[PDB]
Design a binder for this molecule. Structure first.
Ligand SMILES: OCc1ccc(OC2CCOCC2)cc1
Length: 209
């Protein structure tokens, strides 16, 4: 069972701007996604100090980067707090409406796309390099869900029947045909060292077979 939702008009406008604006410094997408993962890990860590059973779904707090040249995907996996169905459909979009408006106004005043994370909508930088993004997520209080969007104004949510994740989020970037540099080990290493060197969780870059 697949449910299809319309983005709020403001978020659809943001995604079109990201897809259509000429902007060569695309590599910042990875910093933004790693930052989101780090924030999600911070959140479950803090909650676990007062309810240690919140880690029954997995004690390890980490970020994995998994390139796959056969599928042309880059996957960013974290074992953070995860998101509920309500997060995916309602809560995050509500927060993203105000962040988008601030970001859009900042861009009109001379900011550039790399500053997107200062407005809390860094996830959408994924569309600098991906034609489709799939988000698989599992929160302790809800079921495992798959969110997906190729932009165009809509996204889908379904219950996920794949490999159970325990807790956390996987962002699968289905890369654009001309963005396969972000599947190369040396390129990912370079970007992590440049932009994500002090993240407080282990980042493991998987090697391809
Ligand atoms: O833990 C990583 C992560 C992944 C995606 C996120 O944002 C939502 C934005 C649009 O709706 C689908 C998900 C936030 C955090």
């Amino acid at each position: 069972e697949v449910e299809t939702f319309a983005f709020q008009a403001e978020i659809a406008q943001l995604m079109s701007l990201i897809i259509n604006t000429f902007y060569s410094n695309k590599e910042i997408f990875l910093r933004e996604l790693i930052s989101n993962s780090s924030d999600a890990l911070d959140k479950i860590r803090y909650e676990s100090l007062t309810d240690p059973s919140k880690l029954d779904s997995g004690k390890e707090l980490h970020i994995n980067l998994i390139p796959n040249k056969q599928d042309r995907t880059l996957t960013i996996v974290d074992t953070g707090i995860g998101m509920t169905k309500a997060d995916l459909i309602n809560n995050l979009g509500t927060i993203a409406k105000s962040g988008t408006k601030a970001f859009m106004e900042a861009l009109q005043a001379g900011a550039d796309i790399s500053m997107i994370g200062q407005f809390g909508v860094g996830f959408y930088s994924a569309y600098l390099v991906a034609e489709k993004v799939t988000v698989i997520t599992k929160h302790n209080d809800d079921e495992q869900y798959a969110w997906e969007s190729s932009a165009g104004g809509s996204f889908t949510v379904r219950t996920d029947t794949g490999e159970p994740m325990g807790r956390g989020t996987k962002v699968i970037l289905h890369l654009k045909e001309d963005q396969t540099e972000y599947l190369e080990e040396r390129r990912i290493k370079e970007i992590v060292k440049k932009h994500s060197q002090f993240i407080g969780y282990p980042i493991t870059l998987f090697v391809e077979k």
